[model samples]
Target: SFHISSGKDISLEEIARAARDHQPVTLHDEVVNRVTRSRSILESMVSDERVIYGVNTSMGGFVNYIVPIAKASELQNNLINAVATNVGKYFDDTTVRATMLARIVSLSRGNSAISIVNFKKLIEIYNQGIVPCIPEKGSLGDLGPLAAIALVCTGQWKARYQGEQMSGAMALEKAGISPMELSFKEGLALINGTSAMVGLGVLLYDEVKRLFDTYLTVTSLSIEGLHGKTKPFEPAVHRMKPHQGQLEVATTIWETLADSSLAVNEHEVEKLIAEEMDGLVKASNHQIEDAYSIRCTPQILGPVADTLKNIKQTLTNELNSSNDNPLIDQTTEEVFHNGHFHGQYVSMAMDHLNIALVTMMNLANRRIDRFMDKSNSNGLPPFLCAENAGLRLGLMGGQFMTASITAESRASCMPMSIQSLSTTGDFQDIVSFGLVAARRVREQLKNLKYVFSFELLCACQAVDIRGTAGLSKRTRALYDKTRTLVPYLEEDKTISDYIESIAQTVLTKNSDI
Candidate 1:
């Protein structure tokens, strides 16, 4: 079980476990106490008839309209009903749960002034696994999506429970929990935040972090399979430039391929160059240097490493933050209005992640060509068709799959943050499309997974054609495992299913690198 409390930070991994790994979540005692204190302060404010943005006055363009204090509590329910405007496809089970958990983390800070009963009910909904059916579109920094979740909490929308899609009331009844009644600013606290996108960011970080390691491992195997030089990856080479992830990439790739006799060093490359000097044709036949994909693996993957670090800290900060518009300051006994709900940080992070993913996928796509083109891949057979050569298209059709996915991913890299239009009577003129960006990242990542899987399968075939007797232990282990999942493509047959089979393992395992 994982516990959440006010003023305490939660790591990304902890959020993933609870959000996706079926771990139960419990509120710390401090959460209840703090929530109660903030609720008391808000009650005093309401009794004194102080004007709050979303409390007594109308919302957005209607902020000038003030309702009587007698209807303030009634206005809370109206808020959720009005904002539940989500449409289109629903987010998956884990993602919906993740967004719910992110909201719980934010509200537990006590600044949101949510009643303790409603807050506990939110936690109970997550712990009991009643995932609200949140739409993937129609949100600006996640307001509409969150309102959809709040609708489920009030037993008005639909929710998924125990693998069945049921009405909101049915879900709560089946889970042995009662429907919640909103009061004061609980509606605004629930529906006015960046939790939806923040949840996606956390999941994207975990997936991309793992897949980047997979890219490094495959790049090592490609070096050996193509008999490329490992000298470029030497620490000395990267130290001259000294970029953050560059040095780390050089060290890691060098160590993984250092023991492989299939790969060459600078001295051995010098020997090859020396021998070809007498014969100009021999010199022309010999490669002056390895291709860009082989030589600049670190430079290619370096920014992804740096960007991953940036993304982790940015997301962690948001997860532990409160995004309420009218935050009640218990210490000062003041209700302050601010723009914490704006998600430019989350929006920018998702755009960077999208660019990073496309960049990596393009590298993997080019390397796939490296294996198919006999001219570029040293002496490997055309399309790695060592057995049948012209009779069967060995891995030739696979490139089409990778090429299409790369195109799809690259086309979707347009920045979503800067595409916002003035909404809600020009009151929300500058909006952050954070949820859309995060959703695009997840979709592109799926394409990236298939591209890497094709690249992995291709590299293994290269190692097979080149002979594995001289392979490093790490590359050898990689080859052996991949062979088990996908055998040598000796007699060409459609292997899309085989690629799919290997894709799962690629995302789950590290290749022991």
Candidate 2:
């Protein structure tokens, strides 16, 4: 099956399948004709002696120097070498696949003046799975990082083929594909785009969307284990509030808690308190209303859900776009030199995504805190310790891990969009560190897994301690599924391994169970 259709929108699921699952990529027939048309436009412009930046003239800070047509090919080769400023560890294999795919998809929009032959080489490399060893840092936008990929295509860089690292030439030979010979604007078209950020955006969107579902499952487990009030998730209450995300979450929570026997209603505790106060409620002990962290989950996570939709829209648009500089408009038969390569939209979206994810982690921290404290634990032993609490330390140490990740995420999640520094000889003065922000947020998602790991651990322990007989069918399967990964702690052993295991589960598997 085709993992990509160049003429149509490539969804995040298709990207994930191709990038992470190693599905082969194919350039559609229409892609060849579209790219051919754009390439024809570039050749005609050059033949007309049109002074296109990076085509007939120098690029960026050196735009003043016009190039002779005889040595234009030399400049294309040299461009990759000069701009390949990326340094640090290589991106993950999946990210490499994603970046390459994003670039191909962007070019297929038929706006960039890239030749069909050069474009088809990219698809061949990806289909053959010759993963470019592009570095993970030093991207003002996508230029440097994408230049690194361009280097691989020209056989001047390193790449991985079949789990073995080798020279780009060797990788190409092993995969039986010829390296692309750079031509006018081909190098520029390959790297001067937001594909680096857009690639990570697709992967991030997929993971975060799945994670939201997993967290909803975990939230269900937490509610049952803590015997928290179900009143906060009532459909009528959320209807009164009328937030799209909040209402959606309320509906899910209501359905998930419908069969639970452990949760209490706000009025259940109010009536008991009124009886004790002699027909008048006079205390703050109305725990029928839970803490904001537990009671306001819909509110807390609403923005995350809402922002995911926005990010998806932003990324989908970015993916389908021709984001490089000096685009060719075949309709008007014009070359538009513009800043379409600027990545502010992606940078800001990632920054907002970081905020949303950190907020999600903080909510997890507070809920775990309730599970740790004796007063808020609703009669369950502190830290959900079923054994000797003081001697065994039962799950008390788990909070330290969760809180540490949350604090680290909070401080490190400073916005990258507004942190742009003028560089490229002030030519690219107003930059969008979109690639940097995208990388940062991917790491933040890893932290989210760790924090959620501790949460699910505590939640499972709480369920076992509080008696799972009253668990909702949804959370019961999840609780049992979690226990399979991590068993009940009879004694305080080193659970460091348990945390890692659960984190992996949350990262890759068990999204449903």
Candidate 3:
């Protein structure tokens, strides 16, 4: 269970775990008191005719209009109803659940001025697994997507209850949790922040990290399959540049290939270098240096590793900060309007990852092509096909398919952060398309997964053809696991299902390799 209080120090891992594993969440004991105090402070400010932005007046374009105290609650409800305009496909249970939990964390900071009853209601709905059917589209990395979560509060939207679909009100009743009546500032607070982008990023980060790990692991297999030398991963070679990610990647590759006998060592290279000195450089079985795909693996993936680290830190800050507009200052008992809700940081981070993921996908596709091409496949048979060469086209079209996906991934890498259009009567003249960027990152990750899977498929065939004589324990383990899902192509057969099976195995949490 995750306990949220003060909206500070929530870890990305905690949010990811709760969203994916159905971990229950609870409010702190003091959160109710904090909520009550903030609500009281808002009430006092309202009585004093203080010009709180969304509390006593309309929002955005209608900010000039003032509402009577008698209609404050109605205004809040109307705001939520008006913003409930999200359309297109709904988010998955995990993402919707993450969005709800993120909202609860923001409210628990004791700022949002929501009633204690409604605050507790959010927790109950999350704990009861009543996932809101939030649309995948409609958020400009702003308020539109959160409206889906807002409808859950008002019990006006559809939701899933214990794997069954139903109305939000019906789900709440079935789960023995009460629906909330909108209070002053509750609706705006619920839908006002960057939770949608943060939540989606949080989940995407986990899967992307998994892809990163799997990429390195499978790349080791491909390197061995190519009979590539490990000279590029030498610590001495990387020590001069000494980038932290580069060093770590070099060390991982070195350790991963420690048990392999096929990779050429320093002395073999020295012999080749001596042969060049004797004016007898011959095209022996050894390549002086592998292709950039093999030789520069660390350099290619190192930057992505660093980018992910930075993005994780930014996402951590976004997840735990007070992102609501008109933030309540408990120390001074005053409300301060600021642009903490702006998602430029998240947008930029997602865009960065978008580019990084496509780069990795393109590299993986190139490695796949290397494994299948007769000229580049070293001594391995063309396409690693052991049987009929003329009639059977082994793994030929697989590279073409992944190459197409790589092209799509490359096109999707155009920066989404800079594509903002003004809305809200120019009040939000500069918007952050953070959620859009996160969605594109997610799509590219899917493409990257398939590209890696295709690479793995080719690498496994190459390993089989090479006889796996000096395979590293790490690559051997992954090879064994992959072969369990897919066998070597003895004859040409429909491999689309096999590709999906191998991809599914890679995605499963049970995959040790």
Best by lDDT: 1
Can you write out model 1's per-residue Cα lDDT over 70-104, one digit (the tens) per residue?
68668878888887887898888778877888998
Q: Is candidate 2 or candidate 3 better by lDDT?
A: 2
Q: Candidates' lDDT values, in order?
A: 0.86, 0.85, 0.83
lDDT of candidate 2 over 230-303, digit per residue (tens): 88898898888767988888789889988998776678788886667666546655544677888899998887
What's the CA RMSD for each of the models?
2.5, 2.1, 2.3
Over 4 Å off, model 3: 5-8, 272-285, 508-513
Clashing residue pairs for model 2: none
Give all TM-scores, in the order shown.
0.96, 0.96, 0.96
Candidate 1: TM-score?
A: 0.96
lDDT of 3 by residue, 285-400 (tens): 55567789999998989998999899999998888877887878888998998988999999999999898888888789899878888899878778877778878887788977
